[PDB]
Design an enzyme around this catalytic site. Structure first.
Site, PDB file in Angstrom:
ATOM      1  N   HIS A  41      -0.864 -61.860   3.660  1.00 58.24           N
ATOM      2  CA  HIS A  41      -2.058 -61.947   4.288  1.00 58.24           C
ATOM      3  C   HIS A  41      -3.264 -61.193   3.433  1.00 58.24           C
ATOM      4  CE1 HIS A  41      -0.645 -57.738   5.837  1.00 58.24           C
ATOM      5  NE2 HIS A  41      -1.795 -57.497   5.643  1.00 58.24           N
ATOM      6  N   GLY A 143      -5.192 -50.762   5.477  1.00 56.21           N
ATOM      7  CA  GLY A 143      -5.201 -50.393   4.048  1.00 56.21           C
ATOM      8  C   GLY A 143      -3.919 -49.935   3.531  1.00 56.21           C
ATOM      9  N   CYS A 145      -0.872 -51.485   4.068  1.00 56.55           N
ATOM     10  CA  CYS A 145       0.043 -52.722   4.122  1.00 56.55           C
ATOM     11  C   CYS A 145       0.439 -53.138   2.487  1.00 56.55           C
ATOM     12  CB  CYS A 145      -0.643 -53.915   4.463  1.00 56.55           C
ATOM     13  SG  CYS A 145      -1.416 -53.941   6.220  1.00 56.55           S
TER      14      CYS A 145
HETATM   15  C1  LIG Z   1      -6.616 -53.955   5.379  1.00 60.00           C
HETATM   16  S1  LIG Z   1      -4.982 -54.614   5.193  1.00 60.00           S
HETATM   17  O1  LIG Z   1      -5.053 -55.636   4.156  1.00 60.00           O
HETATM   18  O2  LIG Z   1      -3.991 -53.512   4.826  1.00 60.00           O
HETATM   19  N1  LIG Z   1      -4.282 -55.136   6.436  1.00 60.00           N
HETATM   20  C2  LIG Z   1      -5.109 -55.983   7.471  1.00 60.00           C
HETATM   21  C3  LIG Z   1      -4.346 -56.987   8.408  1.00 60.00           C
HETATM   22  C4  LIG Z   1      -3.015 -56.413   8.902  1.00 60.00           C
HETATM   23  C5  LIG Z   1      -3.351 -54.885   9.591  1.00 60.00           C
HETATM   24  O3  LIG Z   1      -4.268 -54.887  10.281  1.00 60.00           O
HETATM   25  N2  LIG Z   1      -2.339 -54.172   9.386  1.00 60.00           N
HETATM   26  C6  LIG Z   1      -1.867 -52.987   9.735  1.00 60.00           C
HETATM   27  C7  LIG Z   1      -3.004 -52.063  10.290  1.00 60.00           C
HETATM   28  C8  LIG Z   1      -2.823 -50.980  10.459  1.00 60.00           C
HETATM   29  C9  LIG Z   1      -1.740 -50.250  10.435  1.00 60.00           C
HETATM   30  N3  LIG Z   1      -0.603 -50.864   9.733  1.00 60.00           N
HETATM   31  C10 LIG Z   1      -0.949 -52.183   9.511  1.00 60.00           C
HETATM   32  C11 LIG Z   1      -2.373 -57.413  10.002  1.00 60.00           C
HETATM   33  C12 LIG Z   1      -1.252 -57.967   9.646  1.00 60.00           C
HETATM   34  C13 LIG Z   1      -0.639 -58.796  10.552  1.00 60.00           C
HETATM   35  C14 LIG Z   1      -1.360 -59.058  11.583  1.00 60.00           C
HETATM   36  C15 LIG Z   1      -2.643 -58.769  11.915  1.00 60.00           C
HETATM   37  C16 LIG Z   1      -3.276 -57.886  11.068  1.00 60.00           C
END
Ligand SMILES: CS(=O)(=O)NCC[C@@H](C(=O)Nc1cccnc1)c1ccccc1
Ligand SMILES: CS(=O)(=O)NCC[C@@H](C(=O)Nc1cccnc1)c1ccccc1
Lengths: 304, 304
Positions: A41, A143, A145
């Site tokens: 993603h 952030g 991830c």
């Molecule tokens: C800014 S990034 O690139 O680290 N992630 C953005 C997208 C992510 C996401 O919000 N993941 C997330 C947020 C807060 C805590 N733990 C995990 C997502 C993945 C799957 C379905 C929907 C959203």
């Protein structure tokens, strides 16, 4: 003396963290040898997450669109591919800090350490368990991830988790290092509910053994039980059914303390039925289930 | 989402751990620049610990009696001296992995990470607090002495603790990196009791703010209180008295959540008076006091 929720030393993993940016999305990557592993993603905008066609989104990306930065220095990307829900970015330089490592897909009930990272930089380390419903109760913000979970056997790091998602319930979902999600979760901004979060019975028993070793003994009773009798109680309290495999794994703790596994089950049964009555066990007021029998032996013996 | 007892990434500290042996006693040392810091009781036999005269025991030791091993390689000892309860071994090589560092003497109520080590090798990392009675509730076995506690500010490691002793009660005592014990403890095999272990009120309030931020809100009530009223309750429950300095430090959390500090004190007061009624806060069934207000902000914001 004492018993703490302990994480593995994170040094070997800190040496692998990098920042990956694709367009306006930045997350963490794991650099091992000449490959950087990160959630697929990274290629998505926030709009794309509602219903992403990853194969179609990836066609519009070239090697030069993946910006990989290891601390202050930029890595040159010479290849990219998608494996399940992860991207593998081939870089032109092998990570000099690559430890001896394995990729493992863990079982529910197993524990691991998480090195939470933001922008390729480590923020902290904590100990987790893969829940029976295949979620983890972590501490992750936007952030984070690409932060990874792992275990260590002397010098070998076994990577088992990569963080991808937070469910609307505040619990977390992710993949093994082959990109396969634990549980039924998909990397899409769709409401996905978690199943029943049952208690890891074998872990609670292991933690009761850790309590006896460390002096907390008030919960020991004069009773015994059987697996079928104990399991009627475990069923009522949303505890995992105890099997002979679990009894077998608790054998070393049973031998060390001289308390038969089924007698410890009878202590657990009474604790489920009567509660703690305002008392604590190893500084906790609830039955802890995120220590495996191996974790208890390791901590109580001093394995480095 | 989520809130965990998180430790600092331990990599920078793992790079400093060495094994120190003197005669038949082996413990951990901390190698920073060209000095190795370790507990002075490395010069003692188990018999010597009943009533040691460290100055007299040290006269019979030369530089060649201190064996310092950094992983697999031996360091050459060219000087030794005692500073309070630590030994400082001057070696001929500066540790190449020496991070930017400071030695700090922490205040009771402050938190830190511990890298538990055995034979100069890290076994695990966990988060601690210096208790108001100057003990720490750690996880340490024989041979863990010399393991250190620390905090990290971006690239700077502030060392605050070195482990020396376990009290007969299973709690732990040690020194700052200048060799001065926290509290009244002495490095002698004499029964030394710990004073009252009071609860760190400002930390419990900070953790209640972390709970509200993360969705656990059931404990919020319609009441308020005053510092003097709250403190009558804090006194009854062996909680530290709350001062205006503590209210001031909770200001950022109060601003972020819109819950006035004294209103959160009234929630805390009712929790002390009524208990949890079988409910949990951030997965805990008791009031957690080992998160400072700074820890809560750091974890809830994503500081690396
Ligand atoms: C800014 S990034 O690139 O680290 N992630 C953005 C997208 C992510 C996401 O919000 N993941 C997330 C947020 C807060 C805590 N733990 C995990 C997502 C993945 C799957 C379905 C929907 C959203
Ligand atoms: C084997 S060693 O060199 O690491 N330590 C031996 C002596 C030490 C000691 O048992 N410390 C200890 C034991 C278990 C856990 N945490 C701390 C001691 C220090 C002060 C008064 C009495 C004893």
């Amino acid at each position: 003396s004492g018993f703490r929720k302990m994480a593995f030393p994170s040094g070997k993993v800190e040496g692998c963290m990098v920042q990956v940016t694709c367009g306006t999305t930045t997350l963490n990557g794991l650099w091992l040898d000449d490959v950087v592993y990160c959630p697929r993603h990274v290629i998505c905008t926030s709009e794309d997450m509602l219903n992403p066609n990853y194969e179609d989104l990836l066609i519009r990306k070239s090697n030069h669109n993946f910006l990989v930065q290891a601390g202050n220095v930029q890595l040159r990307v010479i290849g990219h591919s998608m494996q399940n829900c992860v991207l593998k970015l081939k870089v032109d330089t092998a990570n000099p800090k690559t430890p001896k490592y394995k990729f493992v897909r863990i079982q529910p009930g197993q524990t691991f350490s998480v090195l939470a990272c933001y922008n390729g930089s480590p923020s902290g380390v904590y100990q987790c368990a893969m829940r029976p419903n295949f979620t983890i109760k972590g501490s992750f913000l936007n952030g984070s991830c690409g932060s990874v979970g792992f275990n260590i056997d002397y010098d070998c790091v076994s990577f088992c988790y990569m963080h991808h998602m937070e469910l609307p319930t505040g619990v977390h979902a992710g993949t093994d290092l082959e990109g396969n999600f634990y549980g039924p979760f998909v990397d899409r901004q769709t409401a996905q509910a978690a199943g029943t979060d049952t208690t890891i019975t074998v872990n609670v028993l292991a933690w009761l053994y850790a309590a006896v070793i460390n002096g907390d003994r008030w919960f020991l009773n004069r009773f015994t039980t059987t697996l079928n009798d104990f399991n009627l109680v475990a069923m009522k309290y949303n505890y995992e059914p105890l099997t002979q495999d679990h009894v077998d794994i608790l054998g070393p703790l049973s031998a060390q303390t001289g308390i038969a596994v089924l007698d410890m089950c009878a202590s657990l049964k009474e604790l489920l039925q009567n509660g703690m009555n305002g008392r604590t066990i190893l500084g906790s007021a609830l039955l802890e289930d995120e220590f495996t029998p191996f974790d208890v032996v390791r901590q109580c013996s001093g394995v480095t």
